[PDB]
Design an enzyme around this catalytic site. Structure first.
Site, PDB file in Angstrom:
ATOM      1  N   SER A 168      30.925  38.505  52.926  1.00  0.00           N
ATOM      2  CA  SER A 168      31.402  37.489  52.003  1.00  0.00           C
ATOM      3  C   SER A 168      32.916  37.037  52.477  1.00  0.00           C
ATOM      4  O   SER A 168      33.507  36.273  52.244  1.00  0.00           O
ATOM      5  CB  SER A 168      31.875  37.924  50.597  1.00  0.00           C
ATOM      6  OG  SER A 168      30.610  38.483  49.989  1.00  0.00           O
ATOM      7  N   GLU A 179      41.092  43.184  32.227  1.00  0.00           N
ATOM      8  CA  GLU A 179      41.330  44.563  31.740  1.00  0.00           C
ATOM      9  C   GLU A 179      41.557  44.818  30.507  1.00  0.00           C
ATOM     10  O   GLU A 179      41.065  45.942  29.956  1.00  0.00           O
ATOM     11  CB  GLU A 179      42.387  45.020  32.733  1.00  0.00           C
ATOM     12  CG  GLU A 179      42.241  45.070  34.042  1.00  0.00           C
ATOM     13  CD  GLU A 179      40.972  45.860  34.855  1.00  0.00           C
ATOM     14  OE1 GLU A 179      40.711  45.542  35.891  1.00  0.00           O
ATOM     15  OE2 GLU A 179      40.316  46.548  33.859  1.00  0.00           O
ATOM     16  N   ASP A 234      36.403  53.394  31.120  1.00  0.00           N
ATOM     17  CA  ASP A 234      35.988  52.220  31.420  1.00  0.00           C
ATOM     18  C   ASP A 234      34.511  52.199  31.727  1.00  0.00           C
ATOM     19  O   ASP A 234      33.871  53.074  31.078  1.00  0.00           O
ATOM     20  CB  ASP A 234      36.421  51.837  33.082  1.00  0.00           C
ATOM     21  CG  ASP A 234      35.934  52.622  34.016  1.00  0.00           C
ATOM     22  OD1 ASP A 234      35.399  53.656  33.860  1.00  0.00           O
ATOM     23  OD2 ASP A 234      35.879  51.893  35.069  1.00  0.00           O
TER      24      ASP A 234
HETATM   25 NA    NA Z   1      42.182  49.592  38.398  1.00  0.00          NA
END
Ligand code: NA
Ligand SMILES: [Cl-]
Ligand SMILES: [Cl-]
Ligand SMILES: [Cl-]
Length: 164
Positions: free
Chosen positions: A117, A11, A20
């Site tokens: 998954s 991050e 973001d």
């Molecule tokens: Na987050």
């Protein structure tokens, strides 16, 4: 290497409001403020989260506080989710970090959607899971991060985060 160091790599750290890759206001180490397009809304959420009038800037200590809170929340979300908890409980410690990483990025609900998954992970079909995880919006939108997390599920080692 641990979940905190892993997510700090994925991050980054920004002490000013930023957007973001989806274009949403975040701060710190990937802390989502709001999905609203308004910077004013985001500043208001920030001040509410920190407890002071920040004007869009926080200190490193403040970022690390939000991060601690957010990792704790991700773990708690997994344990209270009926689809995620059995998978988490089946995993080794390194692969548990990979699942926490996904929940931190996408949230509890998004990851619980990866039904096929998750089944493969629970069965310890690591190569088959890896291939299935990559067939996703997630992989196509953030491929370098997705590849690191997928490599971690495949191998059960931290190798993808070494040399970084
Ligand atoms: Na987050
Ligand atoms: Cl908060
Ligand atoms: Cl598949
Ligand atoms: Cl990426």
């Amino acid at each position: 290497m641990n979940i905190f160091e892993m997510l700090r790599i994925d991050e980054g750290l920004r002490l000013k409001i930023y957007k973001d890759t989806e274009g949403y206001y975040h701060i710190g180490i990937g802390h989502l403020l709001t999905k609203s397009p308004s910077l004013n809304a985001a500043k208001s959420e920030l001040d509410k989260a920190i407890g002071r009038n920040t004007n869009g800037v926080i200190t490193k200590d403040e970022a690390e506080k939000l991060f601690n809170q957010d990792v704790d929340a991700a773990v708690r979300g997994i344990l209270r989710n009926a689809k995620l908890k059995p998978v988490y409980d089946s995993l080794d410690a390194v692969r548990r970090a990979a699942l926490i990483n996904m929940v931190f990025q996408m949230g509890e609900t998004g990851v619980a959607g990866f039904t096929n998954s998750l089944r493969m992970l629970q069965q310890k079909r690591w190569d088959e899971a890896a291939v299935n995880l990559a067939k996703s919006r997630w992989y196509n939108q953030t491929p370098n991060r997705a590849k690191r997390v997928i490599t971690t599920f495949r191998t059960g080692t931290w190798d993808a985060y070494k040399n970084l």
